[PDB]
Copies of this chain bind each other. A is one copy, B any other.
Amino acid sequence: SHENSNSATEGSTINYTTINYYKDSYAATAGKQSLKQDPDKFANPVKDIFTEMAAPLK
């Protein structure tokens, strides 16, 4: 595994399980990626995050 870092997914800490045969990383498999999701930057991107139980407009 002495390939170049050519893939368009470089920019995370963990690597992926992509098998590759050429010396270029963009020719690799798509593989399986990390199942991390962050819905709070699209669902509730408010400044001061209010909880569920309280009334939102105190």
Contact = CB atoms under 8 A, between A and B. Distances in A.
Contact of A4 (B2, B23, B29, B32): B32
This protein's copies in its complex: 3
Interface in A6-58: 17, 23, 29, 31-32
Contacts of A17: 2, 23
Contacts of A23: 17, 29, 31-32
Contacts of A2: 17, 32
A43 to B, nearest CB: 28
Nearest to A29: B23
A30 B32 CA distance: 23
Interface of A: 2, 4, 17, 23, 29, 31-32
